[PDB]
Amino acid sequence: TTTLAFRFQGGIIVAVDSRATAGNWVASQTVKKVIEINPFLLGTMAGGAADCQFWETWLGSQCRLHELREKERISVAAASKILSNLVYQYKGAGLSMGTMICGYTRKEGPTIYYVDSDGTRLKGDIFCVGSGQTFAYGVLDSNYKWDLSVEDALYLGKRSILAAAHRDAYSGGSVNLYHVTEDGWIYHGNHDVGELFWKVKEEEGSFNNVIG
Amino acid sequence: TSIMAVTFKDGVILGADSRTTTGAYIANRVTDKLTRVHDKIWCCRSGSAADTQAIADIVQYHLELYTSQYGTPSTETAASVFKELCYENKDNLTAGIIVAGYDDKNKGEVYTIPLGGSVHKLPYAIAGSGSTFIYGYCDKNFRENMSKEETVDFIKHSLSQAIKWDGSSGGVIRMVVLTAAGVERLIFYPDEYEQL
Amino acid sequence: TSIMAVTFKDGVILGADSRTTTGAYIANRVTDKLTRVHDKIWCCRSGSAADTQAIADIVQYHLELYTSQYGTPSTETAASVFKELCYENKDNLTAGIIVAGYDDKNKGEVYTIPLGGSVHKLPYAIAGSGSTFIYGYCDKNFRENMSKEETVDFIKHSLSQAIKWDGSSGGVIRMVVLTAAGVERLIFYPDEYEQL
Amino acid sequence: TQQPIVTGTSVISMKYDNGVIIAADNLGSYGSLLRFNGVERLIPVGDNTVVGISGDISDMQHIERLLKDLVTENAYDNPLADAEEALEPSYIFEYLATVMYQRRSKMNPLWNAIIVAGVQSNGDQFLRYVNLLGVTYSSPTLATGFGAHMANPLLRKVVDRESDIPKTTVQVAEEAIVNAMRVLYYRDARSSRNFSLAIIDKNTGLTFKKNLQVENMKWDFAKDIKGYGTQKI
Amino acid sequence: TTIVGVKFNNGVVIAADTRSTQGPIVADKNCAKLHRISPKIWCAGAGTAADTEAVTQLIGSNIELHSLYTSREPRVVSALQMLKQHLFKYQGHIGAYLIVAGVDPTGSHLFSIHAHGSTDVGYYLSLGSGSLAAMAVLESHWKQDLTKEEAIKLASDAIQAGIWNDLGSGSNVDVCVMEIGKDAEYLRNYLTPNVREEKQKSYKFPRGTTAVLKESIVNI
Amino acid sequence: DPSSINGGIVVAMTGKDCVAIACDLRLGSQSLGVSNKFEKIFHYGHVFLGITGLATDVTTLNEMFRYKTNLYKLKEERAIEPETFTQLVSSSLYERRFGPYFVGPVVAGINSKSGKPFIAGFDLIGCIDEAKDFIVSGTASDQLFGMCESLYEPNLEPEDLFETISQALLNAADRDALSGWGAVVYIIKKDEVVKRYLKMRQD
Amino acid sequence: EDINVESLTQSVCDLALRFGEGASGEERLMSRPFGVALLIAGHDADDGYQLF
Amino acid sequence: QFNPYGDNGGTILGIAGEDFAVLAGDTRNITDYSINSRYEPKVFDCGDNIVMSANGFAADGDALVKRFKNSVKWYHFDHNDKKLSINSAARNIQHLLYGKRFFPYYVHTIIAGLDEDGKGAVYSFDPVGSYEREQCRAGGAAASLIMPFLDNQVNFKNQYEPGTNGKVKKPLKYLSVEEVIKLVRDSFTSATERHIQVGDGLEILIVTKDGVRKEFYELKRD
Amino acid sequence: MDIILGIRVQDSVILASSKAVTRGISVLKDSDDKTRQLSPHTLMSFAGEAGDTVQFAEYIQANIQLYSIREDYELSPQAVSSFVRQELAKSIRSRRPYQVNVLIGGYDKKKNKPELYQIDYLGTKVELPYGAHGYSGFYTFSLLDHHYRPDMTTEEGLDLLKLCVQELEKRMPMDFKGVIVKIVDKDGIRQVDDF
Amino acid sequence: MDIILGIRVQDSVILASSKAVTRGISVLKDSDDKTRQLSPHTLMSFAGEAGDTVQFAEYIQANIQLYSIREDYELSPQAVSSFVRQELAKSIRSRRPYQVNVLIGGYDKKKNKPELYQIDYLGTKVELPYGAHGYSGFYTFSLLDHHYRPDMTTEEGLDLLKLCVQELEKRMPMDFKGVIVKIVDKDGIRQVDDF
Ligand SMILES: CC(C)C[C@@H](C=O)NC(=O)[C@H](CC(C)C)NC(=O)[C@H](CC(C)C)NC(=O)OCc1ccccc1
Ligand SMILES: [Mg+2]
Ligand SMILES: [Mg+2]
Ligand SMILES: [Mg+2]
Ligand SMILES: [Mg+2]
Ligand SMILES: [Mg+2]
Ligand SMILES: [Mg+2]
Ligand SMILES: [Mg+2]
Ligand SMILES: [Mg+2]
Structure with a gap:
């Protein structure tokens, strides 16, 4: 798995792969690794499939309840802290989650929290998480820029998950793209690596390690 | 340890060696492994001495309570109580116990309760480290309905041989006789049983 | 396995069960554990079947070589050769072997060689998993200088009881008789020995 | 139970046209010591069920008592306990299966393999297996432990598929069972020659045969087997 | 694997199933487990397949040299001693388990042999994962003085027991018949009771279905 | 275990007067893909050998077999046949019985004299899979078995055999994290050998 | 899925019972009944617009 | 040391059609x-x-x-016999499984049925509750053999239109119940050939608007 | 751990190797050159077990120089890398294996081409446009998969390495104390002082 | 691993804490502030097990603020450090111990003195002129044993920390991504942006 979120001038890009594995068996290539908690808040899933799907879905419930109770959407900080507080209660039980909680409120602005099953919660401008995180980093970091156009950012995110899908045995499938702004998230599609890789190799003239 | 109990024509006889070891050290050379839990219901002990003493103690308590409330408990009932304690606490006991009793209807009875807490009614039973060596001997020499004297001899011969081969057995041979006439304690010394 | 060898008035008799197991599976129900290494020198095998076959084979070779060079080897000499192989390779054998022979001077002889390779000359010897159960029986029933028939009976009774109690023993009872008159093979079936 | 001490080996069983047969030897082993020889491991529940048990004998005795208790309880305020509202094999099974899976799941198994045999009220044969893991299955033949390996292949030659069942008589099934018992005695080091057999028949009811002995054995040829390779005498 | 051996009034019969397994997978559905040590001495193996085949070849080669050297027909007991001594020397680490059968100038013979070097002799034997199922048949139907045709039937029934009841075994029955006074009679696929049914369709692809990046001729 | 560190697969199939053999292109170190061009199929005269497993042994065995077959050709004055090479591979492997090469070799070829298609497989110590419809090997061997038993039928023309062995390899590979990243396919007849590089997923 | 409106209503009433025995046998949660009532309004796919 | 888990082999297979779904399993238990x-x-x-x-x-x-069948029983008690929709069944099965996250049911779950638009549905679960809706899925012993085959035959993976230089995919198409059963039967005969834990019998459950029907096919018994 | 990188461009091969030497909680040295020249147009960088790396590299160097003198001819990069591979394959199954991974940059004066070989301690060898040993490949491979072109000048290769090293200083957990960069081309081997 | 340093000078206590957060072969963050303010004149820095450090520090902070509000009075550094110590001593023998080491810098407004407390996860507490957690003490303690004077100004304390951090960047094996420095004195707590 490879997941990434980053803040830039035009808000937040979120990008994930869609591969799930058991040992060296490719179990699926169509897994949805982003959860849409509400129209302003996204979660990403890395680590244990069940651990992630279950707890982020539950986090969604806690967020809604907060909204019913306080008559306002929960903040990114507080939503990520619900998840962090929960996993920490289980610390040592063997949960396996590397997650990002991403979104917008007026108070905070575009906001990203890294949250894992160790209890680690971090605010930040850039995170890559998963078995393919280093491959995403190497590409994303090299070409990252605060003043990327929205288009260039969407592409850089896509290109970074693509780099990870290629090199990490355990990443692949397709790329799922999101942009988050002050008006919330917007979906930018599912991009099968099967056709994406070749298209990018041609357009870009990259991936020269490969026989074409 | 070498313990046995043998039904016969008039009741039942319990026998045991008197050796308790820790390592190769004989911590007690005159142990009394023949333990009373009711008037004419007794038991033979093998295994952990802490465990078998602790078990017999609690069984004696249960049968005392039984007696004041319900009347005389049967030999079977005593075996039931032992079994319940041995089976339920199987993961934390090392106890190999023979329960033996007299009553006017059945005369003598014998119930062996091996490690694990199962229970088996038998015309006779042998147990303890030393019994392995006398399986063949006891099988070939036991008859139903022996006299008291024939039965004493069988046990004397049996336990003498088990003591001969088993390092964990030795000392004196103890016997308890349960009949209508009451409870009789016997003892035999090495210089007697070692010549048989 | 239940193996024994018994000196008597006219020579020596070897006996064995016929069961070989791997796990609880009886891989061979008619094994022949009575193995010849010279005319009137034989052995009983217990332990690893690979080990005891391999040992007996090499001992047969040594005694064949002995015979062509030096003349008839003694029973003692055969026991010596076994011992040397069992002791020197103790860290890589599981062999419990009884060596038994006839000659005109000593008549019957028996040497047991337990795990580790020590050697013990004895008027009779029992061995194998099943022997534990017949220590007391054999001690009480063995006499020196029995007749052939009395000796066959002793072994039949002995091994029958060992087979009765030992899961690692069973099948038929095999016997080999070594005397001046030569070498005789006997067999007894479950329906005979199980009634004794 | 964390590990078995006193144990019973194979229970074996098969369906035939009008009922079921089940058998188990009378031995309680103690490691490699053949310790107890009159241990009944077939447990009739009412007139329609026989529960055969292998494994830890202490646990078997505990299950026996659970079964007697069922019989007792079922009769309370039950005017038809000997009739319409008697225990069905299927009720006895479901209960045991529930108990075995519960104990597995508390990490404290009843260390047994069990076959439940009987006839349901509509006349249907009942034959189903449960063990210390809570694993359950039915088949025209069932056998536990060692018997699964040698009795099953023998018994399946008789009832190989469901359609063989109505073609199979008690007489034929019983012969198959007994032969398998002889074979187990030949090759299972923890078997005994003495065994019990029960038939449950939709017409004749329960027939419980105690003290059978393995008979008609071949040992003859053993006289001719000498050495282990080259030895001729 | 299921292998058996059955003596009859005038020779010996050997038989095997034909399934070889990489774990729970079947690599070869029609494998050959009946090996020749010499023209009239044949063996069937279970255990580690490479060891079973290698040790077969080693002894076969040596038995042949021995036979040429001594100008004598190879004897089953010679294969026996050579094999067990070799296996013992290797202390079990050559995981060969074999039933060896044959006829020679001294008569007809049947032996089993295990990885540690121990050997048995009898009138009927079985080895491999399916040996308990096979042995149940042998123990039910063997009798002294079998004819050739009866020993073939019995051995073949025994392999079947393993084929049907042992997951370790399957597919076909192979037999070899070694009769005194005759050429060994090797019957490959004596029984073939497990043919795949016809598939529901052909999965032939239209030509050009598969994408190619580049193509070239190779020169041998 | 050593046989799954580098990843990769090989499959060979028989057809009518042809054989085919195929492999992926991956060389990785656990989850890290490293080489996009590591072929696993070699040839000595008209005999083809594919090898999966530990890459260093793949390379070593190749050199060992080029060495052995070259000497064979010199001494025998003719090139080695697939049947003979098969035995050679077996005994070379067995020679290392107790310290084996961690490999799963596969042989394919057409006997120059019978004109008969031949394939075989081996376990890591030389046991021969005499099977003659298809042979599979590598970290996706389960997948390959499944694909072959499904797609295969006997006496395919070379053009059809090409589609079959391609789809078997491609679909098996895409369900394996340690295989893929490209492929090559050889279609082998008496007078012609065609090598092709397949287009596949790059994840 | 969405909770059906009647279910929700039934759920609030079950809580209301908790000055005594629960609908599933629970022990009491409070020492007196509530002194308030509710009009519950909603929509679901099974019974459309409902008022309880 | 008590091991609470076992392996009983078997293989299962779910495929969704346009207005039907199929769930198949072999009948062998090992x-x-x-x-x-x-x-x-x-x-x-x-x-x-x-x-x-x-x-x-x-x-x-x-x-x-x-536990799941019971869950249905109570769903009906609670909601006047309301149909439990398949997506709702799936989410519920997630919870049953994750309830035992620290002592899991050692199984691969598949369910099949129709969605709220009457289209075939398959859902696949891992032992602790992770799930997705899929078009096809094999599970159990021979899944690693059968799944790549389904990828290829149910979803036309790696097939291109000839003459298009491998640029145009073979377009996705809904299979009929006939064509699906053919694939199921061939998957299993194939699994039976190569996997020792598969054999004896093939049971197929076919779901449509009109209900569940069953077919049975023998598989080789070795 | 040690960074060992290689990029093969149009006219040269470029090797970059970290300067740190670290034991326990002490950086012992920040100027360590992790290469030996095997011949005038062949360079080998190395990472791995303490002691093994220098012992192995010098053994190879000694042997290569010996061949140079005996034949009065410089073996090709292809020939040298194969000798190194074989030595490692013998090693891995010997009584004491060298735990050394290597990169070999060479300029083939006959083929007039740069070649770059990655060989690990098992004897796994592969020729690559770019290579790396250790954890560094987890960042550099994807980066170069994106940025590397086949037509590139030496200067571009250098820029490519500036990108890699910048990333490793950003994301690798250990302070590897910079790199020494060496260029292997038709004129031989030189170190880029201004890196 | 995490650098956590403290120097107590004449008129203030100064805390320095590394900015890196590292998991596996990834530096996740280079700007992480490893402190919570417990009260206006008391600061606590922290190192240790993932999750435990923030969970512990915030729990303490919540409790300290609660006391501030309940009593309308700010507990002394001595009182706060003792509460922290006790909480750790209870921790170490509880079912799940916090694996957290801490430094507490505080200005006692009553005694008009800076105080610095080093407390590890066992509940070991000591007051020191300078302190450190982790491997850093292996270099800083001897350095300050040489350079530290009791009479020093805040600025001198700062120079002292420049010396420590310079040494750790030289000799520590991991890239800890610099430090954030905070000064606790009579006017409260402030961060030195120009460090
Ligand atoms: C959101 C995830 C799908 C992200 C993805 C990678 O990060 N994770 C995964 O792919 C992980 C593997 C990874 C932990 C090494 N896989 C998983 O989490 C899979 C679920 C799929 C196979 C459907 N579950 C699993 O691996 O086995 C769980 C288990 C639990 C108890 C007993 C037996 C088996
Ligand atoms: Mg004594
Ligand atoms: Mg016996
Ligand atoms: Mg494989
Ligand atoms: Mg793949
Ligand atoms: Mg990938
Ligand atoms: Mg619904
Ligand atoms: Mg099968
Ligand atoms: Mg089979």
Whole structure:
């Protein structure tokens, strides 16, 4: 798995792969690794499939309840802290989650929290998480820029998950793209690596390690 | 340890060696492994001495309570109580116990309760480290309905041989006789049983 | 396995069960554990079947070589050769072997060689998993200088009881008789020995 | 139970046209010591069920008592306990299966393999297996432990598929069972020659045969087997 | 694997199933487990397949040299001693388990042999994962003085027991018949009771279905 | 275990007067893909050998077999046949019985004299899979078995055999994290050998 | 899925019972009944617009 | 040391059609090298046009199916016999499984049925509750053999239109129930050939608007 | 751990190797050159077990120089890398294996081409446009998969390495104390002082 | 691993804490502030097990603020450090111990003195002129044993920390991504942006 979120001038890009594995068996290539908690808040899933799907879905419930109770959407900080507080209660039980909680409120602005099953919660401008995180980093970091156009950012995110899908045995499938702004998230599609890789190799003239 | 109990024509006889070891050290050379839990219901002990003493103690308590409330408990009932304690606490006991009793209807009875807490009614039973060596001997020499004297001899011969081969057995041979006439304690010394 | 060898008035008799197991599976129900290494020198095998076959084979070779060079080897000499192989390779054998022979001077002889390779000359010897159960029986029933028939009976009774109690023993009872008159093979079936 | 001490080996069983047969030897082993020889491991529940048990004998005795208790309880305020509202094999099974899976799941198994045999009220044969893991299955033949390996292949030659069942008589099934018992005695080091057999028949009811002995054995040829390779005498 | 051996009034019969397994997978559905040590001495193996085949070849080669050297027909007991001594020397680490059968100038013979070097002799034997199922048949139907045709039937029934009841075994029955006074009679696929049914369709692809990046001729 | 560190697969199939053999292109170190061009199929005269497993042994065995077959050709004055090479591979492997090469070799070829298609497989110590419809090997061997038993039928023309062995390899590979990243396919007849590089997923 | 409106209503009433025995046998949660009532309004796919 | 888990082999197979779904399993049940039964069904009609198989450790599988069927019973009690929709069944099965996250049912769950638009549905679960809706899925012993085959034949993966230089995919197409059964039968005969834990019998449950129907096919018994 | 990188461009091969030497909680040295020249147009960088790396590299160097003198001819990069591979394959199954991974940059004066070989301690060898040993490949491979072109000048290769090293200083957990960069081309081997 | 340093000078206590957060072969963050303010004149820095450090520090902070509000009075550094110590001593023998080491810098407004407390996860507490957690003490303690004077100004304390951090960047094996420095004195707590 490879997941990434980053803040830039035009808000937040979120990008994930869609591969799930058991040992060296490719179990699926169509897994949805982003959860849409509400129209302003996204979660990403890395680590244990069940651990992630279950707890982020539950986090969604806690967020809604907060909204019913306080008559306002929960903040990114507080939503990520619900998840962090929960996993920490289980610390040592063997949960396996590397997650990002991403979104917008007026108070905070575009906001990203890294949250894992160790209890680690971090605010930040850039995170890559998963078995393919280093491959995403190497590409994303090299070409990252605060003043990327929205288009260039969407592409850089896509290109970074693509780099990870290629090199990490355990990443692949397709790329799922999101942009988050002050008006919330917007979906930018599912991009099968099967056709994406070749298209990018041609357009870009990259991936020269490969026989074409 | 070498313990046995043998039904016969008039009741039942319990026998045991008197050796308790820790390592190769004989911590007690005159142990009394023949333990009373009711008037004419007794038991033979093998295994952990802490465990078998602790078990017999609690069984004696249960049968005392039984007696004041319900009347005389049967030999079977005593075996039931032992079994319940041995089976339920199987993961934390090392106890190999023979329960033996007299009553006017059945005369003598014998119930062996091996490690694990199962229970088996038998015309006779042998147990303890030393019994392995006398399986063949006891099988070939036991008859139903022996006299008291024939039965004493069988046990004397049996336990003498088990003591001969088993390092964990030795000392004196103890016997308890349960009949209508009451409870009789016997003892035999090495210089007697070692010549048989 | 239940193996024994018994000196008597006219020579020596070897006996064995016929069961070989791997796990609880009886891989061979008619094994022949009575193995010849010279005319009137034989052995009983217990332990690893690979080990005891391999040992007996090499001992047969040594005694064949002995015979062509030096003349008839003694029973003692055969026991010596076994011992040397069992002791020197103790860290890589599981062999419990009884060596038994006839000659005109000593008549019957028996040497047991337990795990580790020590050697013990004895008027009779029992061995194998099943022997534990017949220590007391054999001690009480063995006499020196029995007749052939009395000796066959002793072994039949002995091994029958060992087979009765030992899961690692069973099948038929095999016997080999070594005397001046030569070498005789006997067999007894479950329906005979199980009634004794 | 964390590990078995006193144990019973194979229970074996098969369906035939009008009922079921089940058998188990009378031995309680103690490691490699053949310790107890009159241990009944077939447990009739009412007139329609026989529960055969292998494994830890202490646990078997505990299950026996659970079964007697069922019989007792079922009769309370039950005017038809000997009739319409008697225990069905299927009720006895479901209960045991529930108990075995519960104990597995508390990490404290009843260390047994069990076959439940009987006839349901509509006349249907009942034959189903449960063990210390809570694993359950039915088949025209069932056998536990060692018997699964040698009795099953023998018994399946008789009832190989469901359609063989109505073609199979008690007489034929019983012969198959007994032969398998002889074979187990030949090759299972923890078997005994003495065994019990029960038939449950939709017409004749329960027939419980105690003290059978393995008979008609071949040992003859053993006289001719000498050495282990080259030895001729 | 299921292998058996059955003596009859005038020779010996050997038989095997034909399934070889990489774990729970079947690599070869029609494998050959009946090996020749010499023209009239044949063996069937279970255990580690490479060891079973290698040790077969080693002894076969040596038995042949021995036979040429001594100008004598190879004897089953010679294969026996050579094999067990070799296996013992290797202390079990050559995981060969074999039933060896044959006829020679001294008569007809049947032996089993295990990885540690121990050997048995009898009138009927079985080895491999399916040996308990096979042995149940042998123990039910063997009798002294079998004819050739009866020993073939019995051995073949025994392999079947393993084929049907042992997951370790399957597919076909192979037999070899070694009769005194005759050429060994090797019957490959004596029984073939497990043919795949016809598939529901052909999965032939239209030509050009598969994408190619580049193509070239190779020169041998 | 050593046989799954580098990843990769090989499959060979028989057809009518042809054989085919195929492999992926991956060389990785656990989850890290490293080489996009590591072929696993070699040839000595008209005999083809594919090898999966530990890459260093793949390379070593190749050199060992080029060495052995070259000497064979010199001494025998003719090139080695697939049947003979098969035995050679077996005994070379067995020679290392107790310290084996961690490999799963596969042989394919057409006997120059019978004109008969031949394939075989081996376990890591030389046991021969005499099977003659298809042979599979590598970290996706389960997948390959499944694909072959499904797609295969006997006496395919070379053009059809090409589609079959391609789809078997491609679909098996895409369900394996340690295989893929490209492929090559050889279609082998008496007078012609065609090598092709397949287009596949790059994840 | 969405909770059906009647279910929700039934759920609030079950809580209301908790000055005594629960609908599933629970022990009491409070020492007196509530002194308030509710009009519950909603929509679901099974019974459309409902008022309880 | 008590091991609470076992492996009973078996293989299962779910494929969704446009207006139907299919859930197939073999009927063989195993322990190590032995056959416990040649016919012990493991695909179950749970009501509401929902069929289910929990494959692996059969004791956990049975327990899980039992708990789920019970879950339906109570759903009906609580909601006046309201149909439990398949997506709702799936989310519920997620919770049953994750409830035992620290002592899991050692099984692979598949369920099949129709969605709220009457289209075939398959859902696949890992032992602790992770799930997705899929078009096809194999589970259990021979899944690693059968799944790539389904990828290729149900979803036309790696097939291109000829003459297009491998640039135009073979377009996705809904298969009929006839064509699906053919694929199911061939998958299993193939699994039976190469996997020792597969054989004896093939049971297929077919779900449509009109209900659940069953077909049975023999598989080789070795 | 040690960074060992290689990029093969149009006219040269470029090797970059970290300067740190670290034991326990002490950086012992920040100027360590992790290469030996095997011949005038062949350079080998190395990472791995303490002691093994220098012992192995010098053994190879000694042997290569010996061949140079005996034949009065410089073996090709292809020939040298194969000798190194074989030595490692013998090693891995010997009584004491060298735990050394290597990169070999060479300029083939006959083929007039740069070649770059990655060989690990098992004897796994592969020729690559770019290579790396250790954890560094987890960042550099994807980066170069994006940025590397086949037509590139030496200067571009250098820029490519500036990108890699910048990333490793950003994301690698250990302070590897910079790199020494060496260029292997038709004129031989030189170190880029201004890196 | 995490650098956590403290120097107590004449008129203030100064805390320095590394900015890196590292998991596996990834530096996740280079700007992480490893402190919570417990009260206006008391600061606590922290190192240790993932999750435990923030969970512990915030729990303490919440409790300290609660006391501030309940009593309308700010507990002394001595009182706060003792509460922290006790909480750790209870921790170490509880079912799940916090694996957290801490430094507490505080200005006692009553005694008009800076105080610095080093407390590890066992509940070991000591007051020191300078302190450190982790491997850093292996270099800083001897350095300050040489350079530290009791009479020093805040600025001198700062120079002292420049010396420590310079040494750790030289000799520590991991890239800890610099430090954030905070000064606790009579006017409260402030961060030195120009460090
Ligand atoms: C959101 C995830 C799908 C992200 C993805 C990678 O990060 N994770 C995964 O792919 C992980 C593997 C990874 C932890 C090494 N896989 C998983 O989490 C899979 C679920 C799929 C196979 C459907 N579950 C699993 O691996 O086995 C769980 C288990 C639990 C108890 C007993 C037996 C088996
Ligand atoms: Mg004594
Ligand atoms: Mg016996
Ligand atoms: Mg494989
Ligand atoms: Mg792949
Ligand atoms: Mg990938
Ligand atoms: Mg619904
Ligand atoms: Mg099969
Ligand atoms: Mg089979």
